[model samples]
Structure formats: structure tokens, C-alpha cells
Target chain A: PSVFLFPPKPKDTLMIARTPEVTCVVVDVSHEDPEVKFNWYVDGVEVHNAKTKPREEQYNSTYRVVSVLTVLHQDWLNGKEYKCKVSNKALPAPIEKTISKAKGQPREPQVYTLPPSRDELTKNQVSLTCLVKGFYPSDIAVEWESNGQPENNYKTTPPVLDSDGSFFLYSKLTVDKSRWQQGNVFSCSVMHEALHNHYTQKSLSLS
Target chain B: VFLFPPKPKDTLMIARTPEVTCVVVDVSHEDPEVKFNWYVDGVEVHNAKTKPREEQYNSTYRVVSVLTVLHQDWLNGKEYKCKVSNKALPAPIEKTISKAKGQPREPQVYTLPPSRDELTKNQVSLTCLVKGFYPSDIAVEWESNGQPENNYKTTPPVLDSDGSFFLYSKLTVDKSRWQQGNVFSCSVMHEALHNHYTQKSLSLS
Candidate 1:
């Protein structure tokens, strides 16, 4: 058998409240090697100093490291960059994740499908809700489709602003439950600029 | 003559899911002296702050006073609410669709399946993603060879709007430790009605 293992995968994000300031960035990494190190940076320069802090703990005999960097709103809005960097022998290359102007551009979106309500042996009162989150540049096209066509009989609200400068959309469709017995196909679809060539996100259909 | 102060957004929480949860209602205004009260369908849920909210800051004495009500209170159609009456600004934030939603939407949970690293074909990492859950609250667990494993990191629940909670957990396993016919699974605890928790298992298939 071969012997390849991951050192630690640093997932970075901003935190608010006593855990970490809303304007601050925190990155977490974990590993069992016990020989690796964690570093911080901003704009490609080393920030492994007072401006940033790297702390470690031993949880179940593994190193759980967290590095934090706090910044001001003015600088953050000015497109300042911050990063979390880690190194270990088990790693193929140093892992560096930098967040610069995350507030400015929209990242990928998250899609969730609320299951259809049950106990419908005969009716047309099915509310199928498709939820999407973590998106910015709020111009999004969310639609309910039936048999490969956009159906207009649906319910929705304006894009809601997230605390992290992102957005959320929730759409509900009243399905023609008559088709429920006849294998009717219903789906929730999203279109965003973050996608390539105007391609819409995959659809979550009524099962 | 004076400049009006900033007021916290009106906040209201409703928990329609069947689970044990607390509907957190907050009122953020600049004045620390302002008081907030809790109400549920007109009855007082709490005379004072139920969950102690340590003051937070961003260049002002901002206090988004909190009023905690049981999720049942919200689901019962009781107005689980809080009020913000500090120095200035209008009333409570009834959170009318914190919108601004669509983009390159990815699946709720993304598991890369049991596969060898493209670069280091000797080791394997089983990834279980728990992102995009409305109202960020989830519990994720990892197992290896069918045994409960704990050597991993659980990121703090992240949100985008009244957040569809999206985050991930990873389990790193040595290729040698993985037998040809072994199993690895990443299970997640969430609020989905049918699948309260998602547990995925993979192998050399």
C-alpha cells in the first residue's frame, strides 16, 4: 500500500463577535505530522508578526492551528490582501489562501433543495422551495421550470443581503400535484454571471 | 440641530423546522444604554437579555441587544420578537428578505468521493461538505475503516444572508492504512426534513 497523507487544509473566512472581529480573517489548519509550521501574509509580504497571530492546540493528538489577522474597514475596502500559509513535509507544496477584496466580487453560490411535503395522495398544494446563498453581485435569475420550460406560477422575494456582503434567494413553486402521480418533472434553476457562457446552475427536481 | 445616529436592522426569526433550536433576535443601535426586551406572541419571553451578548464594535458603542426565544415559540406562530429603543433611529428590524440572491450555485454538499490525490497518489483525503443550509446550524462527523475518527477541523458556521449555512470538514487517511476493501464515510447533521443527516460512504469503486 502507498503512504500519502494530507498535512492540513486551511479553510479561511471572516468572523464576527468575540470569536473574531467581523473585519478580521481566520484560517484553520490541522495535521498529525507535528513538524510543520503556520504563517500569515498580506499582499505577498510576510505577516507572521504582531499584525497577525498563529496559535496551536493539541486535539486528539493532532495539531489544530488557527491564524488570525484583523484589518480596518477603510483598508479592507481599499482592496487590501490577506493570506494564510502553511508548510509540511506531507504537503506537495505550501498551501496559501489569500482573500483580497472578497467584499467586492461575488464568489460561487450554494444551492439547497427543501424536500417536497408528503401525505399528498390527491392534491395540488405542493410548495417546492429552492434556496441559494453566499453570492454577491446580486443580479441572479432564479426560475421554476416544469417539463423543460420556465413556469411563471411561483413565489419569491428580492435578493436578501447577507451580513458578509453576500446574498440569499428563496423561491417557492406551487406544483400541479395532479402530475405527481403521472411522473411530473419539476425543477429549480439559477443563472448567475459567476457561471460560464450563461450556463444555469444544475436543477433540483421534485422527486 | 444634530446628525441622526445609525440604527440596527429590524430582526425577526421564525423556526418552522422540526428540531430543537433557539430563535435569536437582535437589535443593534449605537447607544449602549438602550434596553431590549423579549416578547413571544405578546407575552414576555424574557425580562432581560437571555443570552448574554458581550458588546461588539466597529468604531461605535454598538449594541445589537439580543432576545432569545425557543424555536418552538417561533414555530408556534408566536411572535418571537425583540425591540431596539436606544437614543435614535426607528423601530425593530422585521428582516424583510435579507436579499441580494443567484450565482454559480453549487450543490449543497460536495464529496469528492474516495479517490487518490492527483499529485500525491499515495494518500487519500475524504471531504464532506456541509454548506448552503438555510440558517447556519450543523454537526459533521468523520469515520475511517468504519470507526469514528476525530483528527479533523470543523470550521465555524459561515453565512451569507440570514445564512444558508455552508461549511466543510475533511478527513485525511494514509493510503497504507486503507485496505483495498475498506470503507470511509463523512456524515453530516443538519435540518433537512427527510435526510436529517447526510452520511456518504466510498471505496475503490
Candidate 2:
């Protein structure tokens, strides 16, 4: 009795961002050995190519190539990288990969303002402010909501850092002018943990 | 609008993942001349006489009530509190659920057969096999129906690599127009971004 066999493990290429502006690069040749032939590259320039067929009832042996790029304008910053190349001439001679690069400029979120809009026998007290810029480890938290009911009142201060590291957040809110004139609505929310819970809101209405 | 509106700030709850199962508690009076009460630990349970809100027992540790269980009351870590009083103000709310499960389902598809069934004239080969779905996005397609004057077709189709979820798709037909009751068909697709076709047929003897 004698038995021994070993040789299989190579197929790992992942590029995912299906749409924050499209980016999908996937390659997992299953194992290897059936008529494989796929060559595709972008940024190194090759375009597209595929040859591997005969598993119709659905078993395995797949190759897919797709490319469509252009969407990063909100004041664009910079980040770009996409590459894929796979081959098989029996086995031994074609393997190259790279996919994912483009996410660098987007930071300007934090603004809160509310003050005018009073009527209903006056005395709404109205006053709110929380404006942040650049944000980076500046540590800030502020909350207020009314009408939709969640008036945690509001008053938070002490988060102002700027030299280039960037950070700033302020807050204030007071209401009761006949519930701010019957159609009350006031909102201001800003929280920062390096921006993970990213928040920026503003709303005002009373008449 | 007469001063007394700055002592009701304490309600911060957050849960993410399949939408946090479910949680809601409310007690109303709208300050119609003030006088409302509803407690939990200090005992009143709920008032205005119950039913203003009561839905507990989804287990994951009482949904969320930060530890404190005695006698293990069916896996208890108790810390449930919800108080709301009136004379104009009185609020108490707490939530806790360290962690609870939900998220797993989707991945299945396997098949194999076609290494060699006899060929000599011009020599051609075809084989395919897939399983469990992890071969980087399996896909295979090939079709040819018998004796149409001696079947002939193979424009583009041949991919190999059977590792992850097992995969292989091969096609090579031209065996000098191999004849002897000829018939062929292969179709299996799955890009799985929410059901990508998944199947098709035909593989005649």
C-alpha cells in the first residue's frame, strides 16, 4: 500500500468597492488544472482576455474581467491602483495582482446653526451653534432634538484643536416659545471619535 | 414657557447589526397639569397602570441591562431600569447587551464530471467540477447538440483551477468531427451578488 499526492494552492486577488464609485476585482481560480487562460491588466495596460470553458451544469472553472473607472469629484484628492493578470499553459507561468487605491480627500463635515424663527407669544429662547472643521482627534460631542422629541436640552464645550491636526466643535440650544410656535423643530448633532460616528446636522423652524 | 426645562437629559442607546432585534419604551402625560409615575427597581413596575409599553424577553441577556443577576433566573445578569415621573420632570433609562448573534448564510454549489470519454481522430478534451462555491466566482459555459452533420463548435471556453470551492471548465472540440452519437452541453454560473443565475443544462452521452 502506497499513496501520496500534493500540489494545489494559488488564487487570491480581491478588489472591492462595488460603488462608492465602482471597484470590483475578483480572482480565485478554484485550484488550477483544466484549460486555464486569463490575462487582464489595468494601469500596466493589457485590457482583457479569457479562455476556460466546460463546466456548464455548474461545477467550477470561472474567469471574469470588468473595468470602468471615473468618479471622485467632490473636490477630488488622490488614490488609484488597479491590476490583474492570470495564465495557464498546462501550469507554471503567469501570475500578477494589485487592486485598490483611491480614497484621499474628503474632510469638511460639522456645522450647526439655529436662532431666528420665533412666534407663539415669544419666549422660545432660541440659540444654537456647533461648527467643526478638518477634524482629527479633536474629541467632540453635542446633541439636541425637539418636535421629533429628544430634547436632551444641549450644552457641550471644550474641543478646539488647530495647528494643522485640525479640530473644532461647539454647542447650545434652548426652547419654549409656545413649544417654539406650535411647529417646533430644532436639531444640532456633532460627535467625533476621529470621525467614526461622523455627524453633522442643522435645522430650524418656528412660526 | 416658564423656566423649568433643563432636567431631562439621559437617554443614549445604540445598537447595530440586523437592526438590533427590537426595543422601545414610552410613557406619556404631555404635562397636562403634571403628575405621572413609572418605575422598575423602586418597584412601581409601570403606571398610569401598565401597558404604555411592555415587551421584554428576547434573551441575549434581557436585550440590554448591564449586569447584576441573582439566582441565575434563567441566565440573568439583571440591570433593567426605566423610570419616568412628573411634577414636570423625572427621567431614568438604561440599556446594555454586551453582544448577541445573527449573520451567516449563503454559499452552496458543487458538481464534477468530464475528464475523457473517448477521442482520437483530431483529439479533443472536456472536463468540469465545482463545489461549495469559493473558487473565486465560478463560471462555465459550453453547448453542442449531436449529428448536425457531425457536430463542430468551440469558439471560447476553458478555465482551470480547482482549489477553494473546487473549479474546472474545459472545452476542446474538433476531433476530426468525431462521430458516434455526439451531444454536448455545459452551463453553470454564479457571481453571487444576490443570486447570479446559478444554473443551466445539457450534457448528453
Candidate 3:
């Protein structure tokens, strides 16, 4: 048997929702070696305030050590690179891994408002459909309004992941035909990260 | 304005003989046409073929590009890069794959002589089973009486539950040769073997 074994490549976990964003790297050591060290770096500068937590439970016949570094949400949004370097006495050299924000470019969603069919309008109830297609990052907000007032009777579908790594969804507003006969304008507004806080709006009205 | 950027994928699947490696990219674009460029070890590969974009129900598209390389090149462990570009993308999205190292598990080799059902009037089939190997890339050879057997077929590696791979190679020989007590051998070559070959042998009584 060998006296020591080299450490494997470190894996990183990025969580952006926390107050201060969290970037953590987990390294599995061959054993409970006290000499194993986890180092953190940002933009090539060593970080001094990072915390290292070694788990007490053995995992997969190895010990897992996690190193965490907190960064400002602004820096994370700016796409700064964070790295983890794992060092062990038996390793010929330290193994390092660097990760940053996902490089996927955001895409603005296309909004299409469809009016209720004449056959549906004859039944005294009409449903207006809003089609939102082809957006990235999957987070979106769809708001419905009838004559400038928010419509609570609207349903927005959960975002569906498309084959092309984008997302699409549908929002439907149900209302009595009296509002449609009165020519009240119904609008569908979409909010997405790609729009930079701006919204895309589409309206359907009998007039 | 509609702009759909490409999404780089980190998945790779090893395929059949000659060891073809295919990279896939997903994109959403107004124009169906996009560019897929391949590179091996930083050298541009011009001959890689990109298939037409397959549009999905959501109006998103997926495209696949394939590259064929020699088993020797794979054994040498070459890094492959697939770069996809479109009008909307600020930069090309790249996906890369290379032979994985560290903690490779050597395969267990077993040689099985032809069963009665596999025996025919004139020929018999011998099987070499390789199981629980990591990294998937492996070579299997058959030899009869110290001579290489030419009529042999190996299956693509099947992934196991533990992330290892298993496969079998079969060699057909004349029934007379087996009846005459010719020894058959199976040799497995893998990265974990590292200069050593796992060999198994069988012969008829």
C-alpha cells in the first residue's frame, strides 16, 4: 500500500440567493489527514477570511472538507472568478479549480396575446391567452390586467425548459364576456432579467 | 428583437467502434442556421460535420456535430472542443471533453467457452467479458493458439450502476479447432491497466 494518496479535483457550489452570496468548494481527501489544506483565491489573490469546515462523517470511504468564501452579490454579478486549491502532503502538486458566473447569455422573451375565439365568446366567458417563448435563466414574471386594473383571476404556467436551453410559458386570464363586450382592453406584461427591469407588453381589445 | 444564444453542455457519451465522439449544443435563434466548429487539442478540425438544427416544440433548437478519431489518438487522450457561434451570442459557447484520469478502475476479465447452443456444425463462438471498468475506453483482443484471431466483434461499453462500464467481445472459430484442443485467450487493455494487460484463457476438454 502507498503511504499517501493524492487529493482529487475540488468541486464548487455557487449559491447566489443568500444575503451575501456563498461560494464553496468541497474536496474529498483519501483519509482524515490533518495536513490537508484548502485554499481560496479570488482573481489570483489568496483570500484570508475564508472558512474551512471538515465534516465528521466519512463519505464514500473518504473524508470531505468544505471551504466557503462569502462575496458581495455585486461582485458575483460582475462575474469575478473564485478558485479553490487543495494541497496534500502526498500530492506532487496542489490541485486547483476555478469557477465563475454561468456564461449563458440571457434572452428576452417574445410575448403574443391571443384573443378568445368567437365560439368561446358566445358562451359568455372568455379566456385571453398570453404566449411567452424563448427566454433564458427560467425566471420570469407575467402580469395580467383588465382595463388598467390587475386581474387576479389569471393563471401563469411554470416555466418549461426547452430543448434549446431556453424557457417558455403561458398565462391565461379568465373573465366574464360582459367585460369583453364593453371593449375593455386586456394586457399581458412580461418581466425578465434580459429586459433589465423593463417589461414587454401586449394588449387585446375588441375596439 | 429576438436573440437566442447557444447553451454549452457538459455531457459526453462514448459511442461505437473507431470511437466517434459527438458534441451537442442547444440554441434558440430566429435564424435556424448556426455555426459549429470543432478543435482537437487546440488544433482546428475542418472535417467535422454538423447536422441540421432539430427544432423542438418550444421553438428552441438542438444541433449535433460529430468527430471521428482513431483509437490510438483516444488512448493518447486528446482534448476535444466544440465551439458554437451565432449572431446573438457575444462569444462562442464551447464544450470540451478529454479522457478522464485519476482513480480509474481496472476491468475484470473472464473468458467463457462456447455453450452448446452457441456451437454449430462448423463453428463455435467464444466470449470475453470485461466488467466494471472506469473511463469506458478499452480494447479487447482474441487469440487462438498464440495467433491473433481476425473474426471477432466487440460491443460498445454499457454503463453500470456504479458509473463503471461492462462489455463483451466474441470470437468465432471453426468447431474443429475447438475440438482439437486449441487454447483461446482474451486480453483486455485499458488506461487503468497502464502497460499491463488483463488476460483470460479457455480451452475445450
Candidate 4:
């Protein structure tokens, strides 16, 4: 019988979402050595709460194992990095894998402004709607302005996840019909993580 | 068309008689009269109720219709269709949705041994994590050596943005027993597996 020594292959990283989020990595050991060990660390500090799954035999005569590390949801949301290390006598040097959350693939939002309708003008007051769509992560801020002054009479709908996996929301501002007839400009300004230019704004008026 | 299919609305409630809701937004009509038609597998379903169009802040209209069906039908992967018709449209706009079948992924289980710091402080804790499974109802059990143990707490399964779920369970034991290299095991029970359970073991060694 011949004994074979093999180092672990590169690991695959998996991220799990929950109240307390977790990150996991799986590695394949190419030999039958029973001394395989897995370790976990976060930001260069050892994490003692990591869980390792027992090795399972693969069809190709290799062994596959998984290890998971947990952290506070706040830490992961803040882009904390985690690493997994695998070591055994079969390998001269331990292999390592690192992972971190990208805060959900930041995507820019499209903003549109809709002016008050004729029926709304018939009444004493009318509404201006700002539609913000196709944004990722769902963290957005919307501000309204009337005639170059900040306006607070506005309400926003809960962010809705679209079929395309992006978020869309509507923010409405109510103003008197006299203000609308006067052609006072109304603006809807949006802030999102995706925007590098600080904010996106759309303005509408009878002018 | 937004098809609120029969799935877990919240983390805990797997509604037995799930209602499928269909919403059509941004619909515009001069007379404000719009109709919604519901169908299941190409057959008109008359039991569905359609609501009147509610004018939006932008003068556009929104309509919602709901249909309650047997859970068995949903589990059987029946297709539900919603049709919106107004005078402005050349034809009714239609959207269809069906439960994706046979797609439940088995959860990966991992068991963490008691930390060395916890052992030194005589407050040993073990953790089990189950992740990446769909249709989130699952059961977790902890064991010491070969004996069943119950001094554990498990978190409710939380849905991920990717539509899967992950949860964890923790168990605390006396430090003296852990110092002896006692084996701890975690068993995860999920519907996706043919064997009904997956087990992972850990020890001090």
C-alpha cells in the first residue's frame, strides 16, 4: 500500500443571511489523511465560534469539508472581512480564503417626477409624485423642495422589491393649487449608496 | 403584475389556506373602469375578487385582486395568471406565475466545537448552523456523545435576499465534560433531503 500526501485545494466561500449573519468556506482534501483541520478568523483576529463540518468522501476519492464563521449583523453590514484557513501534515503550507460582503451589489436609481393632474388642480391642493426605481440595497433618502426652499410636507412609500431584484419607491408632496398655478418649481432629491455624485434630483413646474 | 404567491409571508406562518394576490399598478383609464381577470392553468377562475382602481398621487391607477386556493393546488405547482384590460389597451396585458417545483436545496450543516476561552472559563458553548435551504421549516437537535440533549436555543429561519434561509442553534454544557473530549453532534432535519436528517459531529481533539 502506498501513502499519498496532498494539500487542500482552494476553498469556496459561501455567505448566509440571518439575524446574525454567517460566512462559510468549503475545501477539498485530496488525500485520505484524517488529520485535516479548519480555522477561522475575522480581520486577522481568531474567531472561536466557528463550526466545522465532518469530512465527507467524494466520488473522486477526495474528502470535502465545510467550516462556518458567524458575526454580528452590524459587523457584516459594515463590510467586515473574514478568513478561513486549512492545515494538515499533508500540506507544506496552509491554504487560506477570505470573504466580505459588498453590501448587496450597489446599483444606481432612476428618478422621475410627475406633475399634478387636472383633477388635482380642480381641488384646492395637488400632489407631486417622485418615482425612484431600480436601486439596490433599498437604503435611500428622498427630499422635496418647493420654489427653491426645502419642503417637509411629503410622504414616501415603503420600498418595494421588483421582479428584477431592484427596489422602487414613490415619494409624494402636496402643495396648494395656488402654488401650482404660480409655476413654483418643485424638486425631488434622492440619495443612495450607488450615486457617486452625492444625489440625484428631478424638478417639475408649470414652467 | 405582482403575483404574491403562496409562500411563507413571514418567518413563522406557513399559511395552510394561502391567498394569492395580484396587483396591477400604473393603470390609467379615462372612465376609471378597469377589469381584472384571473385564471388557473388557462381556465377562468371566477372565485377571484377584483377591487376598484385607486387613483395614485400621479393620477395613475392601481388595482388589486385576490384569490384563495387550496394549499394542495399550490403545492402541486399550478400556474396562476392575471389579465388586466382597459379601453386604452389593444389587448389585455397578461402575467403568469407558477411555483418552481423540485427546487428545494438541502441545507449545509456545520458544528462548532467549544472555544478554548470558554473552556478555560468553564462556560462551554457549541453552535450548529444550517444554511442555504428553501421552504424554511426545519428542525434541529443537539446531542452529547450518544445521548440526546435539549439545553439549546435555535433561531427562527430568516429568509435571505436570494430567497433561501439560514438559521443557527447553540448549546451550553459544563466545562468538565467538554474537557474530556466528549463528542457533540448536531442533527438538522429538512424536507429537501431523502434521509430526512443530516448530522455533524465535533470534539475537543
Worst 10 residues of 1 chain A by lDDT: A1-10
Per-prediction backbone clash count: 15, 23, 0, 1
Q: Please compute DockQ, using alpha carbons, for every candidate against the native two-chain complex.
A: 0.01, 0.01, 0.01, 0.01
Candidate 1 docking: what grade? Answer: incorrect
List the candidates' TM-scores in order: 0.34, 0.18, 0.33, 0.34
Best by lDDT: 4
Instruction: Point out where model 4 deviates above 4 Å.
Output: A1-207, B9-15, B29-31, B103-128, B131-205
Query: What ranges in model 2 sit over 4 Å off?
Result: A1-19, A23-111, A117-130, A136-185, A188-193, A200-207, B1-205
lDDT tens digits, residues A122-191, model 2? 4334433333444644434557786566775454444544334454444545455556556666776654
Better of 3 and 4 by TM-score: 4
Residue pairs in clash, model 3: none
DockQ of 3: 0.01
lDDT of 2 by residue, B68-111 (tens): 22222211222233332333345433333221122211223222
TM-score of chain A of each: 0.44, 0.25, 0.53, 0.53
Better of 3 and 4 by lDDT: 4
